[PDB]
């Protein structure tokens with residue numbers, strides 16, 4: 001089953017949640033940190049225009065992408081000129097804006113509209129910290145937006161309090177961005193051992209459920 005690491009992520013989340021890390025008593029959350037699992041990629045900005053066009057987003061490396069409603073993806077690298085186009089069937093090709101390709105004129109123009117909106121009206125998430133993936137799929141609930149990247153990472157942005165989770169199954173790690181914009185990366189195995197606060201635990205339970213929904217909609 002090639003489900004872009006979701007089954008692994010779900011396994012990792014079941015085990016930690018099953019351990020009931022908020023009940024430990026003697027809780028030592030700091031001992032579960034591991035800055036060697038700090039993620040390289042996450043979504044720093046997003047704009048949902050899914051009624052008409054698609055979902056536009058910026059990655060922390062300043063590349064921008066769009067997942068169109070026709071289920072193709074266009075990625076503009078941070079050089080502002082190199083494009084990666086992912087067709088319906090997963091087939092990838094590379095081009096440049098400057099070659100002014102008839103084929104992708106409309107989709108490039110849209111990506112540029114998204115790009116400019118984000119630069120003028122949105123703030124960069126994770127800004128206070130230092131292969132290029134595309135957005136595989138996303139959905140939103142009343143409480144959050146869930147973004148699944150092609151590298152297996154799942155990001156969950158909670159609207160309410162602006163907290164964010166970035167789950168990386170390759171490292172069996174989770175990064176938590178709290179309301180104060182503080183940024184902490186944990187090994188899930190070590191959260192099972194040392195435990196955590198009710199807040200992070202609750203969001204990890206929520207994450208399991210969101211990963212289930214992603215797996216249920218392939």
Ligand SMILES: O=C(O)[C@@H]1C[C@@H](O)N(c2ccc(F)cc2F)C1
Pocket residue numbers: 047049052110113114117
């Ligand atoms: O006709 C136009 O110029 C397009 C249509 C509008 O939805 N566009 C748009 C789409 C997404 C944005 F973030 C900003 C925009 F201006 C521009």
